[PDB]
Design a protein around this motif. Structure first.
Motif, PDB file in Angstrom:
ATOM      1  N   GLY A  55     -11.183 -13.653  26.780  1.00 36.05           N
ATOM      2  CA  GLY A  55     -11.217 -13.550  25.360  1.00 36.05           C
ATOM      3  C   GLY A  55     -11.038 -12.145  24.809  1.00 36.05           C
ATOM      4  O   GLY A  55     -11.084 -11.979  23.594  1.00 36.05           O
ATOM      5  N   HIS A  56     -10.757 -11.143  25.628  1.00 37.01           N
ATOM      6  CA  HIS A  56     -10.535  -9.744  25.207  1.00 37.01           C
ATOM      7  C   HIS A  56      -9.316  -9.660  24.264  1.00 37.01           C
ATOM      8  O   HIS A  56      -8.236 -10.082  24.706  1.00 37.01           O
ATOM      9  N   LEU A  57      -9.491  -9.189  23.018  1.00 38.14           N
ATOM     10  CA  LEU A  57      -8.388  -8.924  22.057  1.00 38.14           C
ATOM     11  C   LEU A  57      -8.219  -7.391  21.837  1.00 38.14           C
ATOM     12  O   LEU A  57      -9.138  -6.780  21.309  1.00 38.14           O
ATOM     13  N   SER A  91      -2.642   2.695  30.374  1.00 38.86           N
ATOM     14  CA  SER A  91      -3.973   3.271  30.177  1.00 38.86           C
ATOM     15  C   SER A  91      -5.048   2.532  30.960  1.00 38.86           C
ATOM     16  O   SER A  91      -6.207   2.943  30.928  1.00 38.86           O
ATOM     17  N   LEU A  92      -4.642   1.462  31.589  1.00 39.19           N
ATOM     18  CA  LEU A  92      -5.587   0.585  32.222  1.00 39.19           C
ATOM     19  C   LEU A  92      -5.591   0.992  33.648  1.00 39.19           C
ATOM     20  O   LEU A  92      -4.509   1.366  34.196  1.00 39.19           O
ATOM     21  N   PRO A  93      -6.837   0.969  34.480  1.00 37.81           N
ATOM     22  CA  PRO A  93      -6.825   1.166  35.929  1.00 37.81           C
ATOM     23  C   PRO A  93      -6.041   0.052  36.590  1.00 37.81           C
ATOM     24  O   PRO A  93      -5.982  -1.078  36.083  1.00 37.81           O
ATOM     25  N   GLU A  95      -6.498  -2.004  39.036  1.00 34.84           N
ATOM     26  CA  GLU A  95      -7.114  -3.317  39.212  1.00 34.84           C
ATOM     27  C   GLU A  95      -7.374  -4.052  37.898  1.00 34.84           C
ATOM     28  O   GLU A  95      -7.747  -5.236  37.952  1.00 34.84           O
ATOM     29  N   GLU A  96      -7.128  -3.441  36.789  1.00 31.38           N
ATOM     30  CA  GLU A  96      -7.340  -4.102  35.506  1.00 31.38           C
ATOM     31  C   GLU A  96      -6.028  -4.441  34.824  1.00 31.38           C
ATOM     32  O   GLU A  96      -6.087  -5.036  33.839  1.00 31.38           O
ATOM     33  N   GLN A  97      -4.906  -3.996  35.338  1.00 28.97           N
ATOM     34  CA  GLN A  97      -3.624  -4.277  34.744  1.00 28.97           C
ATOM     35  C   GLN A  97      -3.272  -5.748  34.907  1.00 28.97           C
ATOM     36  O   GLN A  97      -3.590  -6.360  35.928  1.00 28.97           O
TER      37      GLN A  97
HETATM   38  N1  LIG Z   1     -12.671  -6.511  24.299  1.00 30.92           N
HETATM   39  C1  LIG Z   1     -13.676  -5.636  25.058  1.00 30.92           C
HETATM   40  C2  LIG Z   1     -13.355  -5.435  26.533  1.00 30.92           C
HETATM   41  C3  LIG Z   1     -14.638  -5.503  27.319  1.00 30.92           C
HETATM   42  C4  LIG Z   1     -15.627  -4.474  26.801  1.00 30.92           C
HETATM   43  C5  LIG Z   1     -14.986  -3.305  26.050  1.00 30.92           C
HETATM   44  C6  LIG Z   1     -13.545  -2.948  26.439  1.00 30.92           C
HETATM   45  C7  LIG Z   1     -12.659  -4.101  26.857  1.00 30.92           C
HETATM   46  C8  LIG Z   1     -12.353  -3.916  28.330  1.00 30.92           C
HETATM   47  N2  LIG Z   1     -10.989  -4.284  28.673  1.00 30.92           N
HETATM   48  C9  LIG Z   1     -10.935  -5.072  29.866  1.00 30.92           C
HETATM   49  C10 LIG Z   1     -10.554  -4.058  30.953  1.00 30.92           C
HETATM   50  C11 LIG Z   1      -9.526  -3.223  30.281  1.00 30.92           C
HETATM   51  C12 LIG Z   1     -10.029  -3.119  28.863  1.00 30.92           C
HETATM   52  O1  LIG Z   1     -10.654  -1.927  28.672  1.00 30.92           O
END
Ligand SMILES: NC[C@@H]1CCCC[C@H]1CN1CCC[C@@H]1O
Lengths: 237, 300
Positions: A55-57, A91-93, A95-97
């Motif tokens: 659900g990350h936006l 900008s993402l590590p 393992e998070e891409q």
């Molecule tokens: N929508 C909040 C998400 C979780 C808590 C705060 C930042 C993001 C983290 N996302 C997932 C990994 C890459 C990216 O940074």
């Protein structure tokens, strides 16, 4: 390949993926000039980039300043979208891409592919689904942060609020799509439904009201009546 | 004028020389081709009467040696070979001419067609695309794949055309993603022209050689290469005026010479409509567009 009704459960597996919607990047109002001609005034827009599992936006606000002195804005908007998604991934590590990025409009495939040449192991996919993410600007808080922005800005929201504590991502995605579909088909009704009951509040960092499980089933039901109904009022059936 | 003698014609074959072709029946008394114009490359090619599959042939330049054809019954095809004994060759040729068992390269004096199809084609470059350095002539056939096709399986048998890919880091400068993808002038002028090909003549010779391999052998990857080199010019906003003018002449004769009924497979709808109507150079190919519209208006 393309994402469609049949490979729909793949969204909820453990491979990181993002949906990208560019339908609210370039937004204008159309007005008449003194000489009685027509001109556009751009307003702030946003890239809708969503992890459907978590659900990350990653709401990138597109400030009207990015258009100043540019030509062919509808086309620029697709490359600007791709520039920003690419920047986000970078900008993402590692393992998070994402392993996959699914664009909701096919016009985004070539811009994003070109901006992601540096990531040959990220698949860029289209979809056959007619997803209603354009209605993201009918969510009050999202529309508000976009319109108030005075500079380029990336804002975070969990579009599922706290739902995943009680339901799965598949169910959470289905709820979200139903709400957005409702909001897109009849924004006034859709919102009337969500907010009829003053006692149900929205939490500071949430987008939607704090319904109990039972109250969600009613809401979901009423959004379904809405979407059937407006189909009748539209097709006379 | 030069001569390519044949030892014999054991199997029924359609023989081609440049854009001319003639039928030879099984064991018909045929000893080759005379009056071949010096100063150009040539291609002699073959389609057996029994296997319309596999067209095949040899690119050669008579200035680089005495060459002849001999059927090989083990490998089952007509092979080009070089005769190093210059006396044995003049000798063989003169007898066959005397007994008049050779067909005459049938060039009409008004006709500059072959010259205009091979204007920029050199053997030295052909031999770099078709690697087989022990021979001065080059074998191509219908089924040979290109280096780029082998990327997406025998490397010694490949067509080593210059790889063009519009969605590659080579084509796209970091930071100019939109600019370079919508206007390939950088890729054309700096990467390919200045960098790989060195000058427009070498670029045009590969283009022309790719077209001819497509036309004469139905070599699909050659056709892909020809269309890509066209599309890169047409999709570049900045092209030397001389390159555009020559391009229009180059493509005009290719379209003029294509067999009317092969046009549906050798001509890519998307590239041609883009080049002639949408691209930066939509207004720079007057001859090519006029012949395309009066000959193949279906494809548009
Ligand atoms: N929508 C909040 C998400 C979780 C808590 C705060 C930042 C993001 C983290 N996302 C997932 C990994 C890459 C990216 O940074």
């Amino acid at each position: 390949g393309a994402m469609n009704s049949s490979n729909y459960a793949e969204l909820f597996n453990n491979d990181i993926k993002l949906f990208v919607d560019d339908t609210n990047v370039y937004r204008v109002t159309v007005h008449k000039t003194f000489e009685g001609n027509v001109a556009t005034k751009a307003i702030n827009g946003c890239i809708f980039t969503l992890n459907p599992k978590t659900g990350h936006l990653f709401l990138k606000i597109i400030h009207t300043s990015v258009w100043a002195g540019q030509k062919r804005l509808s086309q620029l908007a697709k490359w600007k979208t791709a520039e920003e998604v690419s920047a986000l991934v970078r900008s993402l590590p590692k393992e998070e891409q994402p392993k996959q990025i699914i664009v909701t409009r096919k016009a985004m495939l070539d811009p994003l592919e070109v901006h992601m040449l540096d990531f040959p192991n990220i698949a860029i996919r289209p979809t056959e689904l007619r997803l209603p993410f354009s209605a993201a600007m009918s969510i009050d808080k999202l529309s508000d942060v976009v319109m108030k922005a005075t500079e380029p800005q990336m804002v975070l929201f969990n579009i599922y609020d706290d739902w995943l504590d009680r339901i799965s991502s598949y169910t959470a995605f289905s709820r979200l799509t139903l709400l957005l579909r409702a909001l897109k088909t009849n924004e006034e009704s859709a919102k009337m439904i969500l907010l009829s009951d003053p006692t149900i509040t929205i939490k500071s960092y949430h987008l939607w009201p704090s319904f109990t499980d039972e109250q969600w089933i009613t809401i979901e039901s009423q959004m379904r009546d809405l979407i059937l109904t407006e189909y009748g009022r539209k097709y006379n059936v | 004028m030069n001569t390519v003698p044949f030892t014999s014609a054991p199997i029924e074959v359609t023989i081609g020389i440049d854009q001319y072709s003639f039928n030879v029946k099984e064991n018909q008394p045929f000893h080759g081709i005379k009056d071949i114009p010096i100063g150009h490359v040539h291609v002699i090619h073959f389609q057996h009467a029994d296997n319309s599959s596999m067209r095949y042939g040899y690119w050669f330049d008579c200035r680089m040696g005495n060459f002849y054809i001999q059927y090989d019954p083990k490998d089952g095809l007509y092979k080009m070979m070089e005769e190093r004994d210059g006396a044995k060759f003049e000798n063989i040729v003169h007898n066959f001419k005397e007994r008049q068992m050779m067909v005459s390269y049938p060039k009409i004096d008004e006709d500059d067609t072959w010259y205009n199809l091979t204007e920029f084609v050199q053997m030295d470059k052909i031999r770099k695309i078709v690697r087989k350095d022990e021979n001065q002539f080059s074998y191509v056939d219908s089924s040979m794949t290109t280096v780029q096709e082998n990327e997406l399986s025998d490397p010694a048998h490949s067509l080593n055309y210059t790889v063009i890919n519009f969605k590659s880091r080579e084509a796209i400068r970091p930071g100019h993603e939109m600019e370079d993808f919508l206007d390939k002038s950088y890729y054309l002028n700096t990467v390919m022209l200045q960098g790989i090909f060195k000058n427009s003549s070498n670029y045009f010779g590969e283009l022309q050689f790719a077209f001819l391999n497509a036309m004469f052998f139905g070599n699909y990857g050659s056709s892909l290469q020809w269309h890509a080199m066209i599309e890169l010019i047409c999709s570049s906003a900045t092209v030397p005026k001389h390159m555009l003018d020559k391009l229009d002449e180059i493509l005009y004769y290719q379209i003029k010479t294509l067999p009317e009924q092969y046009s549906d497979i050798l001509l890519n709808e998307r590239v041609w409509n883009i080049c002639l109507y949408s691209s930066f150079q939509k207004n720079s190919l007057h001859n090519t567009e006029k012949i395309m519209e009066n000959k193949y208006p279906e494809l548009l």
